[PDB]
Amino acid sequence: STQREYVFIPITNSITIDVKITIGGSDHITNIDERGIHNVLVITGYAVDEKNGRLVPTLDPCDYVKGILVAGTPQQAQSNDFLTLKLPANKLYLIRKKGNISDDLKIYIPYSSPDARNSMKTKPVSISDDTIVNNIIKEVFDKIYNITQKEKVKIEKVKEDIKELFSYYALEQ
Amino acid sequence: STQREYVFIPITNSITIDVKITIGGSDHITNIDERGIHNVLVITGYAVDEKNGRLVPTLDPCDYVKGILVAGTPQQAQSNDFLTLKLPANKLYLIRKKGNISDDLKIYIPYSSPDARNSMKTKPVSISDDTIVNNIIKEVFDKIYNITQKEKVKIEKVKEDIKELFSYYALEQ
Amino acid sequence: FLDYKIIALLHDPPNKAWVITGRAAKYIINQLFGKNYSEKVDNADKLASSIDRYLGSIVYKERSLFENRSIFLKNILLSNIQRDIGNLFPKDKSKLDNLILEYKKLLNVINKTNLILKYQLFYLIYELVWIDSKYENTPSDTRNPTHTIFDHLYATAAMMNWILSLEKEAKGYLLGIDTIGVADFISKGRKTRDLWISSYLVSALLWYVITWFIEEYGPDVILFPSLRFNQFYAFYLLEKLRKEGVSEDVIDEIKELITKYIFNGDDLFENLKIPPYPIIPGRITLILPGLIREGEEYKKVQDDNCFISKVKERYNEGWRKLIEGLRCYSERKREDGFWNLVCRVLKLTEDLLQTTPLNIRVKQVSVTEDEIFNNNKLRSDSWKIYDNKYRQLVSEFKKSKLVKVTPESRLKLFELTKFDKLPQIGEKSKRGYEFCTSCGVLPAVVIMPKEDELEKKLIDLGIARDEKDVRSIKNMISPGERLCPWCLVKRALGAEPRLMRILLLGDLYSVEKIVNEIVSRDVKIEIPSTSDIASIKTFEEMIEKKNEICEDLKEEEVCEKPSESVLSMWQWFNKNYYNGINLTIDPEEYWFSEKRRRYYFSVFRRHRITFPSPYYALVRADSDYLGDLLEGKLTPYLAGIIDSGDYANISEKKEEVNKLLEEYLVNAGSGSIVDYVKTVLKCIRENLNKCSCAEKIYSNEVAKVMFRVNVEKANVEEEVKNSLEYFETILNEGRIIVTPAWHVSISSALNRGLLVELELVNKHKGFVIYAGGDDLLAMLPVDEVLDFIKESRRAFAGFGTEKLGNMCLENGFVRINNAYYPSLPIVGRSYSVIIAHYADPLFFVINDSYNLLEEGKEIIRYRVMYNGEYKDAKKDVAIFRYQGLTSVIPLSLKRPIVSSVSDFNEIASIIDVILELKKRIDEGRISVSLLYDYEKYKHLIVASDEKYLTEFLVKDWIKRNSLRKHVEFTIDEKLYGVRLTIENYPIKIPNDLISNIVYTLRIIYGGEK
Ligand SMILES: Nc1ncnc2c1ncn2[C@@H]1O[C@H](COP(=O)(O)OP(=O)(O)NP(=O)(O)O)[C@@H](O)[C@H]1O
Ligand SMILES: Nc1ncnc2c1ncn2[C@@H]1O[C@H](COP(=O)(O)OP(=O)(O)NP(=O)(O)O)[C@@H](O)[C@H]1O
């Protein structure tokens, strides 16, 4: 059908893996056109787990992760360790609203088991250390989006929304 | 740590035996002391699972489940699908908060899967049909909450707020 | 000095309940001077609402005399539906400056020499970025959680203007605008192009005139409609800043911040470059100080005429700007076609166009220092003027309403018509002149040849300067039509609506700047004709099966490529334009055409697909007794029991009106202050009638004084007397006291409703014509009417089976994802639905929808349930009409509408019945005869009053025409004894509900022939 997967943008290079299709059909929700990154899907109450990279259940009502969506299935080595769900593309927290969706989604999401064993007192870990972006903008914005650095010159624009808008939180252990 | 039990509160007639630590320890969070139901937890990004009731993992920010929090463990035949997360008793968005907690909580939460093989759109529903709230105040209340029915002859002050504070988001699927 | 209202606005932040008695000005400012309070913002807090005079005279100024850790949140109207603000609070104290940095994220790009921007650009985004912090919408006074915090922060800034008008020495005015004949102006049209653009004309022409106001005084001088979710103010401010000149990255702080809340669609004010929905009310009020802005300062003159004419001149100046902009455009475009005509006529007539096809009234009442003050304080009967002056305004309005000046009565035609001094294009009329087929009340200047050689016939008349322009002529103008100047203006403005920008900005650009910005950008805009919406499913049956059932139609350019750019305000045109089928066809040319018809009728049969239905559905709504609620009466609470006329000497209804406000007022409190009232209220006739009833029980106020004592005196022989006089002037006369907060809250609640029903309409294959605060207008396919109403009514009261765009429609409130905003369940709302042939003149359909619900609201009583007993209400009906088959569905069957927090399924339950019936008639469960056999059971049913006999009669009528024998669909008992008391009118309405349930389905299943 019309498959995708929410991939977040961290400041670690451990999130260059879970994209297989890279195309899906020919479309992608979170697009790049003359204005940078639009359709940023910020998750509520989830945090990231770069080391063994997933999204963790958290409960500070403000806990966000801010990433993107690309039309793909992550690695096919999942569907028990990755979240799979079908909602009619209306329950979304999709910011920088630039496109429209067909009112249905078939998503595949990284996610881990809760493990009520320790204190997961998360930390604000924002997107700094811009050095990571310059391989992020290759491994994803170039190795997935076959138009960045091939049809525009304002690559510093997309290299700026990822500095002010793109952030996240993490369990960080 | 102090193991907990998060009772999910739909209108379903299937909350019979899922809290197994009736008294057990010394303090249950959700407390009724001559002023109604206080220490009320509400966890967002979720909804009910009326078919074998649980907290369905969704992504919608307007979705939630308004359940209570006590110290318990379900039936000793689980740790397969339930949500077993520990947070340091701080991130709890609690409503009508009178006191704080032990700064660390292990909570066992009914936690299903999306089980996505059909459309899943959110449905907001309330508690109604006063026999409904009257079937649960004998199904669960007398079991966990002994301080009712003997200390409060203002039995309606605790039956009232449920019909205006105890919502839940359904599925109807 | 004015425009410093930021501290008048933010006299205390939404952190109010987070500085009041635990649960954690405490912060005054970091980017302005010090907020002064000698009596300056004192008055702004005290006179803005009743919460400072309802609960005593000092408690609200102390914010600690009846406190409580839990903070309720009540509806302003029916204080029974609760919300709790709990623990979650504005972002942490330790980071309370970060949000201020989030404050300062776009207030530092343009010069700070002027406040006419630095005060109002933040106004509209104040509420926006704050709900991004998800503040959860605290109330203003916790001892009275009836007004949310932001609402009072704006209501105080409202009358701050009058504060400053007394700060000069004295002045202050309440000005009200209202265009004269709207429902008449809208009537003129032929294809719904003219319909929607005449609506948009009313809207934009009234939007032009108050731009000047918000530029001379800044917003929050306006009361109605609230400049909160204005789809027009949004675009206006936005383009103001865009012309100020900032990178799309610099405005991107505001662009998405709007589109996610307002304009929840995709095609928006930046793809049509125009707001796709007209939302301005044809009437708007203003609280105006006596100051005058002409540069560098604000001077005053003591007169009232300084506005009565200075508003009329602006209203007509907007029309002049528009007409000259159309002159420039048609000149710049004669080389196309049909624009040669517009230029030719705007040159053949210029003086008739020198007067706008609308009119307005303007009344403007005054205020002074006398009896509002004595030296520096507020006396007895000082909180008792604002609503007084408001009533004065509305009394002037409804007095002048007795006369009607239609716009044409302004035209100077006498010479132009007595002699052949009138210019005619086409056929110089044999009979001296003709009337335009659109107005029928003006002499037309363009007279199309009806039809004999339409190609040559008008090339035979020099109107067609050559063989080419005939297409662009014959397109926008149907054969045989006749156009007056005023309606050729609208046919032109329907050729493209982008020129309405000249009206939007209140002369912010120059006119040439606008028109020459839009001669560069070149894009086609389409408007759904009745023939389109009468084919929605016909395209869906051809969208799912694109060419599967299309092979011969693959050449008729309907099953072919959408070619250039076509985009519509119609949301269902934004979500099927790229489905491969061009929604730019003219269905009156393929199958709604005559010659190409029988072919298609034998074509669609082999693909087993239906003949389309020649019927749309003109839905319009109305809020019953809205004016009384704004005035502050209880007819909205008792729609039908009491009328306006039963307010001349209200002392007879001292049973109803004296109830139903107590239970609101006496309950509007909480904690302990509630008891403060829960005793003091009835002690008038219940007690010694004077200020000694409460003095006995007053003490439970002074029973909390000494923990951090601040008060100066405890001798309250006044705050018992004053809290008695307050309720005495309002139960001796059982009205409510109106506040700026009242009005602004209601207008805001109307704007949220605007958004939500804008999402409702186009949720179905709808097409808004005018979404208003308390009204609506649309065209829907005859399949999506009931289900629409059933929610739109419910949604109006505040109830969601769904998330609409991103708004949570809870029980009683409309919560924007943390912001619980109050809806209007107590307000009634009637509906009027016309099932119209596509080949019906819109003039008549609009007239007989407006008058249908116009007199239907004022004529039809039905048996209702008040206080448990049986009464006869008069409003909240849902009228239908096919062509002579009228039907009426009530909607509440209770008074007040939803007196309990779970009464929210009493509403529109009957349409649930009709849905469960219609759903099963066609599924082959119930025969078609169910609606032909009721004419055999109707008499017994209406002659019965033993509801189980009636139940069995209905059960028998259901069972005797069942296709199976095993369907058991039963009607509720309460829908049995109600009776539709219509009286003395040549209209035909069955006098019992189930007959109307039958006739509604008669209509709807008939709207498919
Ligand atoms: N921009 C608009 N487009 C369409 N209808 C509108 C618009 N503004 C107001 N209306 C409606 O037009 C109708 C006119 O209401 P009303 O107050 O009776 O004025 P009128 O019918 O125009 N003439 P009058 O009553 O003498 O002022 C109401 O339904 C208004 O809500
Ligand atoms: N005080 C007011 N301020 C602004 N708009 C108003 C006011 N009163 C009415 N309107 C609107 O203008 C029209 C008023 O005429 P109408 O709606 O017939 O009166 P009403 O006061 O709503 N009573 P009702 O006859 O039951 O509808 C409606 O479109 C209202 O929404």
Ligand SMILES: [Mn+2]
């Ligand atoms: Mn009018």
Ligand SMILES: [Mn+2]
């Ligand atoms: Mn009305």
Ligand SMILES: [Mn+2]
């Ligand atoms: Mn009217």
Ligand SMILES: [Zn+2]
């Ligand atoms: Zn005309």
